[PDB]
Amino acid sequence: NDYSRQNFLDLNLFRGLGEDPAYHPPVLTDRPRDWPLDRWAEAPRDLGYSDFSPYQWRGLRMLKDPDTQAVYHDMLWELRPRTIVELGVYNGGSLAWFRDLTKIMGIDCQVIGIDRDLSRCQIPASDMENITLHQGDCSDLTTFEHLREMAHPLIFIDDAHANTFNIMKWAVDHLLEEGDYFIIEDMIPYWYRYAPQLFSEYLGAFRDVLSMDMLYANASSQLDRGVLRRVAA
Amino acid sequence: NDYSRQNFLDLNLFRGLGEDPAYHPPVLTDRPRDWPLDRWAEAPRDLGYSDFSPYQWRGLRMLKDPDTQAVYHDMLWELRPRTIVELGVYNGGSLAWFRDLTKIMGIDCQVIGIDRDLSRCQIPASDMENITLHQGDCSDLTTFEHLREMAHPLIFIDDAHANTFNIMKWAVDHLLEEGDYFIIEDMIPYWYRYAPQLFSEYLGAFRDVLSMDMLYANASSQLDRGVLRR
Amino acid sequence: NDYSRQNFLDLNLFRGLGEDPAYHPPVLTDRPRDWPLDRWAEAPRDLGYSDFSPYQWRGLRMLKDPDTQAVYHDMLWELRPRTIVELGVYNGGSLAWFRDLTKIMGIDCQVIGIDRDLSRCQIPASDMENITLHQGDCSDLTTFEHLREMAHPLIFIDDAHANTFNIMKWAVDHLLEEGDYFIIEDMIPYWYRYAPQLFSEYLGAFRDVLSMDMLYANASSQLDRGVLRRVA
Amino acid sequence: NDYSRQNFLDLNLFRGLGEDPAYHPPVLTDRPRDWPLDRWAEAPRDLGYSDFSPYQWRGLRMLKDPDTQAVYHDMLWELRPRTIVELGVYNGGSLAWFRDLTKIMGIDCQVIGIDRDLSRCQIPASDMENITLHQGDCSDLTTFEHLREMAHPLIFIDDAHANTFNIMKWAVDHLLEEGDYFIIEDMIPYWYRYAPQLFSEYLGAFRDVLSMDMLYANASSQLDRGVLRRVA
Amino acid sequence: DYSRQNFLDLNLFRGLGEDPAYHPPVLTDRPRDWPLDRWAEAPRDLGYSDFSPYQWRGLRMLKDPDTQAVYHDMLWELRPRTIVELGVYNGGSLAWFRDLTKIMGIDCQVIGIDRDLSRCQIPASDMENITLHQGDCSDLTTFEHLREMAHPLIFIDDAHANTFNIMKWAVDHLLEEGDYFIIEDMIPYWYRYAPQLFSEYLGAFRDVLSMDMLYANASSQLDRGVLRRVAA
Amino acid sequence: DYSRQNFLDLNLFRGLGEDPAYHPPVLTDRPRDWPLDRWAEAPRDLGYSDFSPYQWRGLRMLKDPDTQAVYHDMLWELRPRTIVELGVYNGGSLAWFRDLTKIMGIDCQVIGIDRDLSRCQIPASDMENITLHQGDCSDLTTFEHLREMAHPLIFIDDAHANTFNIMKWAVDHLLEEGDYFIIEDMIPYWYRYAPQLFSEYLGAFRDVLSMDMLYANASSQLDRGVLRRVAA
Ligand SMILES: [Mg+2]
Ligand SMILES: [Mg+2]
Ligand SMILES: [Mg+2]
Ligand SMILES: [Mg+2]
Ligand SMILES: [Mg+2]
């Protein structure tokens, strides 16, 4: 009866994130790491550990999978953006990744992390060149005014998914010049499954300003149908 | 330009539920309802509308899909519950279904629906025989305390998913008896996927009090590995 | 030894029906019913028993699986039929279900079941209110010529599958009214596979009197492309 | 309004067989046969006709598909049957096939086909060497003690599917010597689905006289779990 | 141990296997004779590798059953008096073509061409209407050396070296109207790897060849590679 | 026209494509800017060929994202001083490996061995820490001649010729405990085509090499071919 004295957490705290913001190399349970080559044909063919979010960049966790990394790579190489914003930080491995990548492409880029809870960031202070954190609430649209200094072209990425359509209208009006991206990750397929009528009306409300970039918008499951930018249709 | 003059409801509110608690029948957009038989083989084979949650019961939207209904039908026939508690209510279609089914079966059952927002419920007052609504909070257990003098057997069903494991602890200590069910719809495969270490330990904390019922636990994707009892 | 001493029942008698018209709850063999929770993840994920026809309604077996039940629910709620005729009966599970469901909806509806052999039926006689059995050979236009005048709207369901296109020509001329359904369960995808030319033409012969109802024709594997109704 | 002046054949007579015993080549309806190579990539990737049973041997229809043919080709090469009995005939395509293939392999084999209705047979009277058609009723078992005693080894194939287990009980007692095959095409997977208890128990009756030949029993979809032989 | 052996390049056996001779499959992890009393406990998988299991009369067959069915229909329609196969390996398909044309009553001459014939397993006694020819591919003169052959003619590429030039020569010097030129296996791969070059090269033959859509989509090995001469 | 053209052998492009230089994809059947008011009508597929559409800093990449992710992890764990690609093509892999070791801060040299370094597309300025070498995969003297590099080292085989002989050489004269010998793409094909000989050949290295199960199942290019030293 271990339950009778336990206080249990709401496991929803870990929705789509996992339990620990820091990376740990996967650990084999039902097999040796070194398999005998004389019994090579008998060796189990499955992954060996959970395939939920096993990705990393330099000892930091990555919530963007390799297919998403390939898309953002092409997008960065093409646009050569001076600014990449990120609503939703979590552990910050995405922030660091964008920074490292741009550095090697020779793009002078500023990466910006806005979140209401920056406590879980895992980047060391001694590895923060061209990265800026920003405490803020999504619901509050005035969180976003103070990033009207940054240069163009610009990529705005929504990994937070709250008050998102109001944030999209705020950006369109006050932020995005021609060519800039507004990308919503993960959620467009769910909103459209759960709310076809309202979703189509809201998305279509931006028919005069944004468009879906078809070169990138079907190239990874995380970005599926959610990559937009300020360009004429 | 229609984006500026409009202001946007948050679509997260319609998550796993939909835009509207009232039932509306599907409507065809890209094909006539009445396909002519002389061109019978040209007719599209796909369903012709959203497969999201198109199910109903007597004009009330039903979130439990036909496979889950089959499972619960068998559970009711086998266990003949005196009480069905539904945590999380939405449109009330589950409540009216559970009541109608126990009525044709001859079982004397009270259905109970607990939820913080009951405004979405579509059951008319006139059809509430053996159904009781209850407005309360998950995060405090006082909600449930009051009226733990219901007859058994009992089936408790979590459709709210807040403070779930505490509510289950409370349930074993105060409500449940041998043969009663505690059922976690939908969530378990996700909680395991995302927090496996923590979930495993938590579920196994209940090893001396609850067990997974293997006759029902693999029979529906909504009840997948969440049918517990005793 | 055992083989010489037996008479062997022909197994085609049980085609798509099972060995026993009475219901029995499925039984686990390779696992305990109450899996311990400290090994929750170790538990097997498959069903644990045959998926053939394990469906029931109040202790009666159901040959229409849950998805078909959903389609018939919507159709009953929309049309509010006065009569439902089932061609082929077996255990009566559907009959009971149809009557019970119309009762719950407040639809005054008589349910009629027709079969050559009504000995399999399992409905307790004290539970036949608004259910009528007719004994009679399906492949005989006589059986339907002898039926009384029923109330409309009506749903006519073919679960027998013998001499079916003649029965349908009779239905169109003598029974069906605007809005009424002639449903063929199970059989149409097979008839199309084995006889595409003859089937296409035969079905096409009813182009001015029946149409495929597209709201329900693709909503279930059992009713798939077999939901028809009068006019348009 | 063509339905009122039509003669409706029973489509069930075509089950698993088709409309016409005679072969006719498949035909394209929605594309040219000669696709131009300057639009090669635009060309469709799908078969272009019904994939139910488009197989032939020398202008005769073959109900046995290529995978099943491959299994029989090997079984013949290994066993070198002196006799092949095919219970159930239709167009006689597999009869001709069996005779033709055994002839090419240098096997001295007699192909026998039994059926109630031999009218459909499409084999010319002239091309009938080493092939005997018997009249037969699967209900009466002195139809098979109407065997002139043929040579061994012997393959016995069931394509008729009536009174099958009794015809099997008979085969063991009067025909099958060490190594002879009794094959049931098509039915076994469906019988296990519908009557798992009886099927398991009936087959289990023959444990001391027949075994399932695992070299071939998993090798095609039509012979699936249906290939058996004498002893072990 | 590894310190001793000289290692053969395994690329030698690509798409072919280690041994041109046929040997029947052998079960490793089950009895060949499965007891009927535990019939449902029997494993459902093939029980041996499925790389290239097929045979004709004790010779390996690299063309699988679906491919044989297409060639069977082609041969029966077209009635070729010459079948050329560029690339030979074990000779299985060579003997199959000859045997099929023989029971079809067609007067066909099957020709086999290869730089290495040492792997050909056809017995010299079973060689009638078959000619082996040992020449290199990229040298087009190999082919001039025998356009004495009768028509209709089916030319088959199983070697895949310098294929388009060989097709050019064939179009000009060999193929009368109706004749086939088939590329097995490779065209899907060439389109995947070099889509611009492949399309342009295939389109360069638009007034002389077409894709035969009756056979081009009917097997995975022939897939989009069955071409024939349209009148010019 | 065809009789004019001399046709290149498409096998030259096998596994690589026609152009070592990167060009981004373009759409044919859709606009790049899809209008949001038609968002649900937009096509769902990629829009271009998904053969080898990957890149690094304007250079082609043959290793796909999942493979990249396995090499990322490996590099971070192993901190290799020397990485050796056996086969170069366009050099994309070389540049990535060098760039990646640089952002991780690892002091690494990258060597690229190939008979043909002509297709290499790395600009002269960006060659810091990237030594190239001409040589044949038939000399084991090609590999000695490469001066002694620091360890830990990884050895990737992307040429696949005389590989097992090259593996024996590396174990004895080059590889220390924990160094890697990785064979890309090829092992699953060599075990399908030659199961017996591959089983025996790999088996010989049991005392000096293991399979690294942390990485061996994590991508389809590396599938079952990542090795190092110390098992059982
Ligand atoms: Mg993401
Ligand atoms: Mg519910
Ligand atoms: Mg049914
Ligand atoms: Mg082949
Ligand atoms: Mg590779």
Side-chain angles (χ1 to χ4, degrees):
Chain A
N1 304 342
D2 295 347
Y3 79 94
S4 220
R5 71 205 109 164
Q6 231 144 308
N7 184 143
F8 294 98
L9 297 174
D10 200 323
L11 266 10
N12 287 138
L13 296 161
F14 317 119
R15 193 93 196 169
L17 305 180
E19 321 177 52
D20 196 325
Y23 178 64
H24 297 95
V27 122
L28 259 47
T29 53
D30 68 7
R31 67 195 68 168
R33 193 182 157 153
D34 308 65
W35 191 270
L37 250 50
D38 69 312
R39 282 176 192 175
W40 174 90
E42 289 171 63
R45 289 242 240 140
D46 74 279
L47 192 39
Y49 46 99
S50 165
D51 81 326
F52 150 55
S53 182
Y55 299 113
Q56 60 124 315
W57 181 260
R58 312 208 297 131
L60 304 181
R61 294 196 51 205
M62 275 295 336
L63 307 173
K64 298 171 162 38
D65 57 33
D67 293 310
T68 297
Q69 294 177 42
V71 171
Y72 274 121
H73 179 260
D74 300 358
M75 184 187 290
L76 268 41
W77 185 243
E78 176 170 30
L79 228 203
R80 300 185 69 76
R82 299 268 307 187
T83 307
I84 307 164
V85 193
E86 262 259 341
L87 297 219
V89 176
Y90 191 53
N91 88 122
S94 282
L95 277 21
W97 181 76
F98 279 118
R99 189 270 319 278
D100 284 330
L101 229 70
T102 41
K103 232 203 79 103
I104 345 192
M105 294 178 215
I107 301 152
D108 180 306
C109 194
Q110 298 302 324
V111 188
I112 299 158
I114 306 150
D115 206 63
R116 70 221 247 66
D117 189 13
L118 307 171
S119 67
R120 315 130 110 180
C121 191
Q122 300 300 310
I123 311 174
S126 58
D127 190 18
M128 210 64 132
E129 206 156 57
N130 293 235
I131 309 181
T132 311
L133 273 30
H134 262 296
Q135 188 59 53
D137 200 24
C138 293
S139 158
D140 208 64
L141 268 171
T142 303
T143 290
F144 306 90
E145 150 65 7
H146 243 105
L147 293 313
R148 232 291 83 220
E149 316 124 338
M150 306 286 147
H152 291 245
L154 185 147
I155 296 164
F156 196 95
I157 310 169
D158 174 61
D159 281 308
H161 323 318
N163 198 41
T164 288
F165 277 107
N166 286 319
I167 274 156
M168 213 165 113
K169 113 168 163 210
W170 173 89
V172 156
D173 288 342
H174 297 321
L175 191 59
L176 314 149
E177 258 118 16
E178 202 217 291
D180 294 3
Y181 280 74
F182 190 93
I183 294 156
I184 297 165
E185 300 198 331
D186 300 299
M187 298 267 91
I188 259 86
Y190 297 95
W191 291 338
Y192 181 65
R193 183 167 184 76
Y194 296 136
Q197 265 185 103
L198 265 171
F199 178 80
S200 298
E201 197 195 339
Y202 292 175
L203 236 204
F206 305 83
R207 69 167 153 85
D208 288 327
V209 292
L210 302 165
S211 57
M212 181 155 67
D213 185 337
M214 295 304 280
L215 195 74
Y216 300 130
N218 286 330
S220 93
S221 78
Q222 288 171 324
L223 304 172
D224 184 22
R225 292 171 281 161
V227 176
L228 325 165
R229 52 168 190 168
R230 223 249 55 90
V231 163
Chain B
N1 250 46
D2 287 299
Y3 69 94
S4 54
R5 67 186 25 79
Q6 194 168 25
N7 203 276
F8 306 104
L9 304 148
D10 204 298
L11 273 25
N12 293 325
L13 262 357
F14 311 126
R15 186 94 185 178
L17 297 164
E19 298 166 273
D20 191 351
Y23 179 72
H24 300 281
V27 166
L28 277 346
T29 44
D30 72 342
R31 54 159 121 309
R33 219 242 243 213
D34 299 293
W35 201 274
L37 266 24
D38 66 289
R39 319 191 114 76
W40 170 89
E42 307 178 9
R45 311 258 325 263
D46 76 307
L47 182 62
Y49 53 83
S50 181
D51 66 339
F52 157 50
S53 172
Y55 302 110
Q56 60 146 326
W57 183 256
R58 294 202 301 165
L60 297 169
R61 292 198 54 219
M62 270 284 306
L63 302 192
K64 299 181 190 327
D65 68 34
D67 281 292
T68 299
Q69 294 172 49
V71 165
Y72 274 116
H73 169 294
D74 294 339
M75 197 184 265
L76 267 40
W77 188 251
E78 177 188 18
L79 195 247
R80 300 190 71 76
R82 296 288 243 97
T83 306
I84 298 173
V85 188
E86 258 281 15
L87 221 190
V89 160
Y90 193 54
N91 71 306
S94 273
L95 275 20
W97 179 70
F98 277 127
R99 188 278 314 282
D100 286 348
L101 261 192
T102 50
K103 226 217 183 194
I104 44 234
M105 286 179 185
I107 298 147
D108 186 28
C109 193
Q110 300 292 325
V111 183
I112 286 144
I114 299 163
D115 197 285
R116 48 161 197 165
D117 177 22
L118 288 168
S119 58
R120 272 105 113 260
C121 189
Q122 307 290 312
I123 305 153
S126 73
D127 190 41
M128 281 291 286
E129 181 163 292
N130 301 147
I131 312 176
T132 314
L133 277 358
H134 253 89
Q135 195 159 266
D137 203 21
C138 279
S139 250
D140 90 299
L141 307 170
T142 318
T143 291
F144 316 98
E145 235 137 61
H146 284 174
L147 263 83
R148 65 183 182 283
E149 47 256 295
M150 289 279 97
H152 300 230
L154 168 154
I155 298 175
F156 194 95
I157 304 170
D158 167 52
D159 278 304
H161 323 330
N163 214 43
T164 301
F165 277 99
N166 282 337
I167 286 156
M168 201 167 55
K169 159 178 174 191
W170 182 91
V172 173
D173 282 338
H174 302 313
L175 199 31
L176 308 182
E177 305 181 347
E178 207 195 321
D180 289 11
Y181 281 79
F182 191 96
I183 289 165
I184 311 175
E185 298 198 344
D186 297 293
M187 290 294 116
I188 272 162
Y190 293 101
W191 283 339
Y192 177 49
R193 168 139 198 103
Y194 295 132
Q197 213 217 236
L198 249 202
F199 175 78
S200 297
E201 141 183 357
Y202 276 7
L203 236 199
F206 291 81
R207 90 166 136 290
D208 306 324
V209 287
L210 292 177
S211 76
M212 185 151 57
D213 185 350
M214 302 301 294
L215 188 72
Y216 302 124
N218 291 324
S220 147
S221 73
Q222 278 171 325
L223 307 176
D224 184 19
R225 294 170 283 172
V227 190
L228 319 180
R229 72 167 176 171
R230 111 217 254 200
Chain C
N1 182 84
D2 293 45
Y3 64 87
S4 61
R5 328 271 307 181
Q6 226 146 336
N7 180 269
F8 283 120
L9 291 151
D10 182 325
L11 270 29
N12 294 329
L13 264 25
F14 313 123
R15 203 74 181 179
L17 300 177
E19 352 193 32
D20 192 356
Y23 177 70
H24 298 112
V27 131
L28 276 349
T29 37
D30 71 347
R31 67 204 62 170
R33 204 180 148 153
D34 294 297
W35 196 270
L37 258 32
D38 60 310
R39 283 177 179 170
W40 170 89
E42 281 179 35
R45 302 253 253 106
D46 66 304
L47 199 55
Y49 57 86
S50 184
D51 72 302
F52 159 49
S53 202
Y55 300 116
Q56 57 130 346
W57 182 249
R58 309 207 286 144
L60 305 170
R61 292 189 59 212
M62 277 284 276
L63 299 187
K64 312 196 192 307
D65 61 34
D67 291 277
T68 298
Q69 291 171 46
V71 172
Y72 273 119
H73 178 294
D74 299 331
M75 180 195 292
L76 263 42
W77 185 248
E78 168 172 50
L79 214 219
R80 305 189 58 84
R82 296 298 320 288
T83 309
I84 299 167
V85 175
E86 256 277 11
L87 213 197
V89 155
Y90 190 58
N91 82 311
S94 317
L95 265 31
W97 181 74
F98 274 125
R99 181 277 320 284
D100 283 339
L101 218 63
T102 46
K103 204 244 227 77
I104 291 169
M105 289 182 184
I107 298 156
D108 174 33
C109 188
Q110 311 295 135
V111 181
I112 305 165
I114 303 169
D115 213 307
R116 215 245 256 240
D117 169 27
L118 298 159
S119 79
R120 266 98 141 264
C121 194
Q122 296 289 295
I123 297 166
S126 75
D127 187 32
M128 293 291 300
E129 169 148 283
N130 303 329
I131 304 181
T132 305
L133 284 358
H134 276 88
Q135 170 110 17
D137 187 14
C138 151
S139 44
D140 191 331
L141 278 156
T142 307
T143 305
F144 315 84
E145 280 176 21
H146 281 133
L147 294 188
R148 225 147 256 249
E149 38 158 311
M150 296 146 260
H152 300 278
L154 190 141
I155 302 184
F156 191 97
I157 303 170
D158 172 56
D159 290 299
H161 319 295
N163 178 220
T164 299
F165 278 109
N166 271 313
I167 280 139
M168 198 159 91
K169 145 175 196 227
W170 169 92
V172 172
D173 292 355
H174 286 305
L175 183 59
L176 300 181
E177 255 180 41
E178 232 244 89
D180 290 358
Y181 282 85
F182 199 102
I183 294 161
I184 295 168
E185 300 201 0
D186 296 306
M187 213 60 29
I188 279 172
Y190 293 96
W191 284 339
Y192 185 53
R193 200 99 210 292
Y194 299 132
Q197 179 94 137
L198 264 153
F199 178 86
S200 284
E201 208 226 303
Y202 282 5
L203 222 215
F206 299 76
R207 86 200 161 263
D208 297 327
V209 294
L210 291 162
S211 64
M212 196 154 41
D213 184 353
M214 285 296 108
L215 197 69
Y216 305 128
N218 289 344
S220 145
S221 79
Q222 297 181 303
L223 312 172
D224 164 35
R225 285 165 293 160
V227 175
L228 323 166
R229 65 172 192 177
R230 229 281 173 71
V231 158
Chain D
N1 214 278
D2 306 351
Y3 80 85
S4 36
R5 56 198 126 79
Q6 199 115 38
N7 193 256
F8 291 119
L9 304 178
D10 195 356
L11 264 21
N12 292 311
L13 262 31
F14 309 137
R15 194 86 171 193
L17 298 177
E19 346 192 38
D20 203 337
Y23 175 73
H24 294 114
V27 157
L28 275 16
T29 57
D30 70 325
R31 30 139 115 52
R33 202 187 146 150
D34 300 271
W35 199 271
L37 266 28
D38 67 300
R39 322 234 139 161
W40 174 85
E42 313 184 359
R45 291 271 274 289
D46 75 287
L47 191 52
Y49 51 85
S50 177
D51 85 304
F52 146 60
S53 193
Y55 298 117
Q56 49 141 349
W57 185 257
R58 306 200 296 127
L60 295 160
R61 293 186 57 215
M62 278 280 289
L63 308 178
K64 294 197 208 319
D65 69 35
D67 292 301
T68 290
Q69 290 175 37
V71 167
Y72 277 115
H73 175 284
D74 300 343
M75 184 184 292
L76 264 53
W77 190 242
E78 187 185 21
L79 206 247
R80 314 192 57 74
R82 216 57 128 49
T83 304
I84 293 162
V85 182
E86 184 127 277
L87 211 216
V89 164
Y90 196 51
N91 76 309
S94 31
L95 264 30
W97 189 71
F98 272 126
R99 187 276 322 276
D100 283 326
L101 199 66
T102 39
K103 207 244 218 125
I104 300 153
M105 286 178 177
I107 301 167
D108 176 47
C109 191
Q110 287 290 330
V111 186
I112 292 154
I114 295 161
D115 205 84
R116 223 190 335 92
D117 178 3
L118 299 156
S119 73
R120 283 102 105 255
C121 191
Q122 296 289 284
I123 298 156
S126 82
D127 183 56
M128 202 61 195
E129 175 162 280
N130 282 300
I131 308 180
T132 305
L133 282 5
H134 278 237
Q135 185 53 41
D137 202 46
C138 322
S139 209
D140 181 67
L141 294 103
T142 62
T143 294
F144 303 82
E145 289 203 274
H146 244 300
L147 235 283
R148 301 277 157 167
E149 248 332 283
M150 303 297 294
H152 290 63
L154 178 144
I155 297 166
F156 187 108
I157 295 154
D158 171 46
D159 278 299
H161 313 148
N163 200 213
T164 300
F165 273 81
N166 276 343
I167 290 167
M168 192 160 94
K169 149 184 78 194
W170 177 87
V172 175
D173 290 356
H174 293 138
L175 204 55
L176 312 185
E177 273 147 28
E178 219 166 299
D180 289 0
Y181 283 75
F182 192 93
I183 294 160
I184 296 148
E185 305 198 341
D186 299 304
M187 300 313 284
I188 275 166
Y190 296 93
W191 283 337
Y192 185 52
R193 189 143 136 94
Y194 300 133
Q197 210 178 133
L198 255 201
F199 180 83
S200 294
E201 194 185 340
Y202 280 7
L203 230 207
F206 298 77
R207 92 203 70 90
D208 287 327
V209 298
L210 298 168
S211 79
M212 175 155 93
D213 177 356
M214 303 296 293
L215 223 225
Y216 303 119
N218 277 340
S220 101
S221 90
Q222 294 166 307
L223 305 167
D224 191 10
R225 288 112 97 203
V227 179
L228 327 153
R229 58 181 195 162
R230 194 69 204 250
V231 173
Chain E
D1 223 70
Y2 76 100
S3 48
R4 302 313 231 68
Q5 302 189 62
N6 184 92
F7 290 120
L8 288 129
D9 204 342
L10 274 36
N11 290 321
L12 235 65
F13 316 105
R14 176 151 235 100
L16 296 184
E18 315 181 53
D19 187 354
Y22 174 75
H23 291 105
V26 191
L27 294 320
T28 61
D29 76 314
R30 359 117 123 63
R32 167 122 181 219
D33 302 314
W34 197 272
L36 266 30
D37 78 304
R38 305 191 167 147
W39 169 91
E41 311 182 3
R44 300 275 305 267
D45 75 295
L46 198 51
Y48 52 86
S49 157
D50 77 336
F51 158 43
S52 191
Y54 304 113
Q55 70 163 322
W56 184 256
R57 306 214 292 134
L59 302 157
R60 292 190 63 213
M61 264 293 287
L62 294 169
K63 304 196 198 310
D64 61 39
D66 290 298
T67 293
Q68 294 173 34
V70 171
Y71 276 123
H72 170 92
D73 296 342
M74 192 183 296
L75 263 63
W76 172 262
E77 172 173 31
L78 207 241
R79 304 183 80 74
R81 312 198 77 232
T82 307
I83 289 173
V84 190
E85 205 147 27
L86 231 189
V88 158
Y89 188 57
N90 82 293
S93 48
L94 254 39
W96 180 76
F97 276 131
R98 192 272 323 287
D99 284 333
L100 252 282
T101 45
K102 239 253 276 222
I103 43 239
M104 281 181 184
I106 295 150
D107 181 6
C108 191
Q109 291 284 342
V110 177
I111 288 141
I113 295 167
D114 204 310
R115 70 144 164 202
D116 191 10
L117 299 177
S118 92
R119 284 114 100 241
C120 182
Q121 309 293 307
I122 302 165
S125 59
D126 181 38
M127 206 56 198
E128 164 164 272
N129 288 290
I130 306 177
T131 306
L132 270 22
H133 270 127
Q134 184 163 263
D136 197 48
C137 229
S138 66
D139 188 18
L140 286 161
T141 28
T142 303
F143 309 105
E144 214 114 311
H145 287 199
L146 39 150
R147 59 164 180 166
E148 289 113 356
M149 290 314 310
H151 298 82
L153 178 149
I154 296 165
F155 190 104
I156 306 177
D157 177 44
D158 284 296
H160 316 117
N162 199 207
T163 311
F164 273 93
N165 272 332
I166 286 153
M167 192 164 95
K168 161 186 71 174
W169 173 90
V171 165
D172 285 326
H173 295 94
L174 203 70
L175 303 169
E176 297 185 359
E177 149 172 31
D179 290 354
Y180 279 82
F181 188 103
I182 289 145
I183 300 168
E184 294 186 355
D185 303 302
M186 221 94 301
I187 273 173
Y189 295 101
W190 290 336
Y191 183 58
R192 184 169 172 69
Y193 298 132
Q196 185 133 135
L197 255 175
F198 175 76
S199 280
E200 188 222 309
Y201 276 16
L202 232 211
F205 299 73
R206 97 205 75 93
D207 293 303
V208 281
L209 295 170
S210 65
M211 181 158 52
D212 187 345
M213 295 302 293
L214 190 63
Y215 305 127
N217 285 326
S219 105
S220 102
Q221 296 176 308
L222 306 179
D223 175 30
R224 285 171 288 160
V226 185
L227 314 172
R228 68 171 173 178
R229 173 93 158 172
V230 171
Chain F
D1 197 80
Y2 64 98
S3 57
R4 278 143 240 287
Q5 253 159 322
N6 167 83
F7 296 96
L8 295 177
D9 205 320
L10 270 350
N11 295 325
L12 253 15
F13 311 122
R14 158 160 244 92
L16 302 174
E18 7 185 13
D19 197 339
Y22 178 77
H23 288 107
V26 279
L27 298 328
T28 68
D29 67 340
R30 5 116 125 60
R32 211 194 142 146
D33 319 296
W34 199 273
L36 263 30
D37 72 292
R38 286 199 218 289
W39 168 97
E41 315 190 338
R44 292 283 289 281
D45 67 292
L46 204 50
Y48 51 88
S49 173
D50 74 341
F51 154 51
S52 180
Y54 300 112
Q55 69 142 320
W56 184 252
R57 297 183 329 110
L59 287 170
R60 289 195 57 193
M61 276 271 306
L62 304 183
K63 293 167 178 31
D64 69 36
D66 293 301
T67 293
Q68 285 173 56
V70 167
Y71 277 112
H72 167 82
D73 282 353
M74 193 182 292
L75 270 40
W76 179 256
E77 210 202 350
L78 204 260
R79 295 191 73 92
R81 256 65 194 292
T82 312
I83 305 156
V84 186
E85 278 255 308
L86 211 204
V88 177
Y89 193 53
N90 84 115
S93 301
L94 278 20
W96 176 74
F97 267 133
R98 189 280 329 279
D99 274 327
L100 198 25
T101 40
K102 190 148 157 66
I103 11 162
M104 294 164 167
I106 296 152
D107 180 50
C108 200
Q109 308 300 323
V110 187
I111 292 97
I113 305 162
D114 205 334
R115 52 138 122 290
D116 185 12
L117 313 174
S118 72
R119 282 102 113 267
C120 190
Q121 293 275 306
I122 301 173
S125 67
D126 213 76
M127 279 281 239
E128 186 151 271
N129 273 267
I130 302 190
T131 30
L132 274 52
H133 258 260
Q134 193 135 289
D136 208 0
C137 310
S138 277
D139 278 65
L140 301 186
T141 19
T142 296
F143 302 109
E144 278 139 48
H145 280 144
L146 266 55
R147 310 210 86 194
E148 219 36 66
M149 326 118 241
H151 310 244
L153 151 145
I154 292 152
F155 188 107
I156 312 150
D157 162 59
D158 282 325
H160 321 321
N162 196 33
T163 311
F164 283 90
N165 275 333
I166 284 171
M167 209 165 70
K168 111 183 200 107
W169 174 87
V171 152
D172 295 346
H173 304 280
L174 183 70
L175 295 190
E176 291 173 9
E177 167 144 53
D179 284 3
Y180 277 86
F181 198 99
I182 297 180
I183 296 153
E184 298 192 340
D185 289 297
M186 220 67 4
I187 277 163
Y189 290 98
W190 285 339
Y191 173 69
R192 171 169 204 66
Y193 300 137
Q196 187 174 307
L197 262 191
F198 179 83
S199 260
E200 154 181 348
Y201 275 18
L202 246 210
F205 295 82
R206 73 215 110 97
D207 304 309
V208 279
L209 280 177
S210 83
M211 176 151 73
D212 188 337
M213 298 299 291
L214 197 79
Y215 298 135
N217 299 341
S219 106
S220 70
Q221 284 170 325
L222 308 188
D223 164 38
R224 275 178 292 170
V226 179
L227 320 176
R228 35 170 214 182
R229 166 93 180 74
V230 78

